[PDB]
Amino acid sequence: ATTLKEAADGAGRDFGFALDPNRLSEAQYKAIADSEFNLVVAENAMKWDATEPSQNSFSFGAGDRVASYAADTGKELYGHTLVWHSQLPDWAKNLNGSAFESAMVNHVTKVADHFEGKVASWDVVNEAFADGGGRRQDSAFQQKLGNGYIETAFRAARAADPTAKLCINDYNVEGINAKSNSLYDLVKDFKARGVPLDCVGFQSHLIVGQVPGDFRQNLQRFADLGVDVRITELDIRMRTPSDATKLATQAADYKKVVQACMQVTRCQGVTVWGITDKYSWVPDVFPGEGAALVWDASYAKKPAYAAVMEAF
Amino acid sequence: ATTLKEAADGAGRDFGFALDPNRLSEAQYKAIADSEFNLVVAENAMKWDATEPSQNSFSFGAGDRVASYAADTGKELYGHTLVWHSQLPDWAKNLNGSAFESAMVNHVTKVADHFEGKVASWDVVNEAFADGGGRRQDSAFQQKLGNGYIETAFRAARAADPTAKLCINDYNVEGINAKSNSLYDLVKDFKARGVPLDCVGFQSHLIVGQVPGDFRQNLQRFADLGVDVRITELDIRMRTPSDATKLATQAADYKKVVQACMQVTRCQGVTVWGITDKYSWVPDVFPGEGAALVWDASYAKKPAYAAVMEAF
Ligand SMILES: *[C@H]1OC[C@@H](O[C@@H]2OC[C@@H](O)[C@H](O)[C@H]2O)[C@H](O)[C@H]1F
Ligand SMILES: *[C@H]1OC[C@@H](O[C@@H]2OC[C@@H](O)[C@H](O)[C@H]2O)[C@H](O)[C@H]1F
């Protein structure tokens, strides 16, 4: 193949990227986006703060722009998170009990209903667990609604969009540990009780040379529960600046991740969180680290490119 | 060339179609739209009734969908009419004097401002004249505001979008007659007084075998005034059903129209009002007539296709 899209296509798998609609006006960005991927997801356009800035006041502008792009270029559309503790408008954080639940139910219904027929999969709930097991405590949803909020979100989503794949997404759950265990118990329980849940997303915000050795083993156990798995926000950061060795290691890491997916029949594909290091979110969140994506700040293919290519 | 797009491209000219965003979900429609044209215009998505259904309440959804399509496929975007007597919401028709003028000025400003940078040209004023000379009398704009409404629309448009080509559009003005004469005097006056006006659009809703023999002569006289000309809503209707002779004549008519444009250096291009006869507006407006477009109800190329091809 000449592009990563063909490699993914030939493998019968998805290979997507996080889209920032405002970058489509940049020739090189659009060029790569058009030819290297077969799936697209909104980096921020479909989140709560972007879709419902004020209670009941929805703004689907940017969201629609992403959906239009997918439809116009023939790529699958991945919906990014309906329920998430981060990037939640203050008006929502100010609501409580009944009112807060009604707002959550309404947000899930309106957003899912609006993109019905466009998005193939949804990150219904994102990052509900805490590192080290258990539910996260700094979540407005966990605090105000308790344990049953996630089930309510999945049931509300299925009602608004009866055909979209409803997924649960999280990070630091790639390998077997206390967090992925709590997630495992949840998926197992939901499927046993018939709660609408079709997929599990593994963020995969990894560090160079530290790819979980039991990655595929972990992916497989979830797949055995009767659900699809997917690598949702892949990027492998390193200590900047980059050098030959760091890039060589990063290339081997990207390979391991894709191979793991290729080894699990239910792994739908891999989505890298962005196109070029020039726009990567890493440096702003992880001070001193970066160079996490496949294309550098000059839009030049890094050693990771060929690795992903042959991994497929 | 293998497509009409390449023929138009090689000629350094535009060849567009009227887009109905709801048809992009139809495989054959999208396929033709993607490969046969290099310019696109909203059939109805950007009109007054679609963009401002209620005073001050703008709905750019469908409009944005058309703009996204153009940007995603690399086609030029033609903005279709800001001011038009038809398809005008009742709330507007109920306003008078000052209030009505402020509404017109606001509509022109908001819509032009929203698509600023996307649309290359605008039909600022559409169908302001009457068949037989003079201004049309069944227009809410002409009745409530008088003769100066058009100049006000062009000045308001230029302020909202300083770079878009501001055009005036009309039908039954293809050949030299009392209507095209009144239009000519207007363009001449506007250019002499420095009123913002860059182009003149000729609808070209013709009848089979009745193409104005002085078409190009008429196009040329307008071009000599220092403005660009364009065929905006081309379709050549016949009495249904169609037959070999009718299609043979239609093919020769399409050729004459394109050749006329090719003979006038300032003729920007040709826009056909639709893709297939299956969706053509003709039969609903002109009872008993149809088969006006290049593709039939089965999406099969008619004799007109090859004609347009060689005309370019
Ligand atoms: C996985 O982590 C990445 C996150 O996306 C970022 O959110 C914050 C925003 O400022 C950045 O632009 C994004 O890249 C995504 O939502 C999450 F699920
Ligand atoms: C040139 O004539 C065609 C007209 O477009 C039609 O308007 C009425 C609407 O119901 C049809 O769907 C359209 O095709 C366009 O506005 C005009 F300038």
Side-chain angles (χ1 to χ4, degrees):
Chain A
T2 310
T3 66
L4 299 181
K5 166 179 167 57
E6 287 188 72
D9 289 349
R13 284 178 169 69
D14 296 332
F15 180 61
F17 73 110
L19 177 71
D20 179 335
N22 297 326
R23 302 303 176 180
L24 292 173
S25 65
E26 193 176 340
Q28 193 57 78
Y29 182 102
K30 186 194 193 308
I32 296 173
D34 291 339
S35 59
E36 302 291 350
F37 308 91
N38 64 13
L39 175 147
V40 65
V41 57
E43 183 186 30
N44 293 287
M46 293 186 186
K47 293 172 181 172
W48 196 309
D49 66 334
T51 55
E52 191 179 7
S54 297
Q55 189 162 198
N56 298 314
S57 297
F58 296 86
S59 172
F60 296 115
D64 290 325
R65 186 65 187 90
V66 178
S68 290
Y69 175 76
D72 296 333
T73 54
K75 306 181 192 303
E76 176 185 333
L77 212 202
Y78 193 86
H80 188 44
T81 204
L82 293 170
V83 177
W84 191 29
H85 73 287
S86 189
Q87 284 184 81
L88 184 66
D90 278 32
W91 67 260
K93 290 182 173 183
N94 300 160
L95 303 178
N96 275 95
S98 314
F100 181 82
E101 176 176 42
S102 296
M104 183 192 73
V105 173
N106 183 242
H107 182 87
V108 171
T109 303
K110 293 300 180 298
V111 180
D113 178 77
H114 180 77
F115 294 106
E116 182 166 10
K118 288 79 185 304
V119 302
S121 300
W122 266 117
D123 271 341
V124 179
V125 178
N126 187 56
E127 305 171 10
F129 295 91
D131 300 318
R135 305 295 193 87
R136 75 160 52 242
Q137 308 192 199
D138 65 324
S139 164
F141 298 93
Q142 183 64 54
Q143 295 171 2
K144 298 169 187 292
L145 305 177
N147 293 330
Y149 84 86
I150 158 177
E151 178 173 352
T152 303
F154 279 90
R155 291 196 184 281
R158 172 57 70 236
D161 193 335
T163 53
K165 302 298 181 177
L166 308 190
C167 318
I168 184 171
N169 198 46
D170 222 322
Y171 64 94
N172 282 349
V173 294
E174 292 72 38
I176 297 177
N177 54 233
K179 197 179 184 179
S180 60
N181 283 351
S182 290
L183 181 63
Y184 182 89
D185 297 335
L186 188 286
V187 179
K188 196 179 189 63
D189 179 55
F190 272 27
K191 300 303 293 182
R193 293 189 295 116
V195 183
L197 193 172
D198 313 290
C199 35
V200 187
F202 299 84
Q203 294 192 17
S204 301
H205 284 299
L206 309 176
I207 300 175
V208 60
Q210 297 177 19
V211 175
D214 58 344
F215 202 150
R216 102 115 177 79
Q217 294 86 292
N218 184 48
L219 291 181
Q220 188 60 71
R221 67 176 180 146
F222 276 89
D224 297 323
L225 289 176
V227 295
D228 294 296
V229 296
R230 183 189 303 262
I231 289 70
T232 59
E233 316 175 41
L234 182 70
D235 58 13
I236 311 178
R237 65 187 196 268
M238 63 182 75
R239 222 61 181 54
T240 51
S242 59
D243 52 52
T245 62
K246 287 178 178 170
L247 295 177
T249 307
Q250 179 183 69
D253 297 325
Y254 264 101
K255 196 167 191 297
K256 299 181 185 181
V257 178
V258 184
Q259 293 179 168
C261 183
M262 292 302 288
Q263 287 174 238
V264 180
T265 57
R266 281 176 144 290
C267 185
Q268 300 306 108
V270 180
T271 294
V272 295
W273 210 241
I275 293 186
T276 175
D277 296 322
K278 181 168 59 178
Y279 299 133
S280 181
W281 77 307
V282 176
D284 310 89
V285 176
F286 306 97
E289 294 180 283
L293 302 169
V294 182
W295 281 266
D296 58 35
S298 293
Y299 288 105
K301 307 180 193 302
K302 305 199 303 187
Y305 185 91
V308 172
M309 175 82 86
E310 54 182 13
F312 272 124
Chain B
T2 310
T3 66
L4 299 181
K5 166 179 167 57
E6 287 188 72
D9 289 349
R13 284 178 169 69
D14 296 332
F15 180 61
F17 73 110
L19 177 71
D20 179 335
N22 297 326
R23 302 303 176 180
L24 292 173
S25 65
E26 193 176 340
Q28 193 57 78
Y29 182 102
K30 186 194 193 308
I32 296 173
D34 291 339
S35 59
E36 302 291 350
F37 308 91
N38 64 13
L39 175 147
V40 65
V41 57
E43 183 186 30
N44 293 287
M46 293 186 186
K47 293 172 181 172
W48 196 309
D49 66 334
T51 55
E52 191 179 7
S54 297
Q55 189 162 198
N56 298 314
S57 297
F58 296 86
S59 172
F60 296 115
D64 290 325
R65 186 65 187 90
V66 178
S68 290
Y69 175 76
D72 296 333
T73 54
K75 306 181 192 303
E76 176 185 333
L77 212 202
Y78 193 86
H80 188 44
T81 204
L82 293 170
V83 177
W84 191 29
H85 73 287
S86 189
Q87 284 184 81
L88 184 66
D90 278 32
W91 67 260
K93 290 182 173 183
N94 300 160
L95 303 178
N96 275 95
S98 314
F100 181 82
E101 176 176 42
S102 296
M104 183 192 73
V105 173
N106 183 242
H107 182 87
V108 171
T109 303
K110 293 300 180 298
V111 180
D113 178 77
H114 180 77
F115 294 106
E116 182 166 10
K118 288 79 185 304
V119 302
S121 300
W122 266 117
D123 271 341
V124 179
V125 178
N126 187 56
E127 305 171 10
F129 295 91
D131 300 318
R135 305 295 193 87
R136 75 160 52 242
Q137 308 192 199
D138 65 324
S139 164
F141 298 93
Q142 183 64 54
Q143 295 171 2
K144 298 169 187 292
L145 305 177
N147 293 330
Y149 84 86
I150 158 177
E151 178 173 352
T152 303
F154 279 90
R155 291 196 184 281
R158 172 57 70 236
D161 193 335
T163 53
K165 302 298 181 177
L166 308 190
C167 318
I168 184 171
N169 198 46
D170 222 322
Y171 64 94
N172 282 349
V173 294
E174 292 72 38
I176 297 177
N177 54 233
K179 197 179 184 179
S180 60
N181 283 351
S182 290
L183 181 63
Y184 182 89
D185 297 335
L186 188 286
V187 179
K188 196 179 189 63
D189 179 55
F190 272 27
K191 300 303 293 182
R193 293 189 295 116
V195 183
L197 193 172
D198 313 290
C199 35
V200 187
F202 299 84
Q203 294 192 17
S204 301
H205 284 299
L206 309 176
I207 300 175
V208 60
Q210 297 177 19
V211 175
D214 58 344
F215 202 150
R216 102 115 177 79
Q217 294 86 292
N218 184 48
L219 291 181
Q220 188 60 71
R221 67 176 180 146
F222 276 89
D224 297 323
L225 289 176
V227 295
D228 294 296
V229 296
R230 183 189 303 262
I231 289 70
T232 59
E233 316 175 41
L234 182 70
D235 58 13
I236 311 178
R237 65 187 196 268
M238 63 182 75
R239 222 61 181 54
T240 51
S242 59
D243 52 52
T245 62
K246 287 178 178 170
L247 295 177
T249 307
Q250 179 183 69
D253 297 325
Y254 264 101
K255 196 167 191 297
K256 299 181 185 181
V257 178
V258 184
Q259 293 179 168
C261 183
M262 292 302 288
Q263 287 174 238
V264 180
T265 57
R266 281 176 144 290
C267 185
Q268 300 306 108
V270 180
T271 294
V272 295
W273 210 241
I275 293 186
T276 175
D277 296 322
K278 181 168 59 178
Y279 299 133
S280 181
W281 77 307
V282 176
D284 310 89
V285 176
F286 306 97
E289 294 180 283
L293 302 169
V294 182
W295 281 266
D296 58 35
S298 293
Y299 288 105
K301 307 180 193 302
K302 305 199 303 187
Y305 185 91
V308 172
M309 175 82 86
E310 54 182 13
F312 272 124

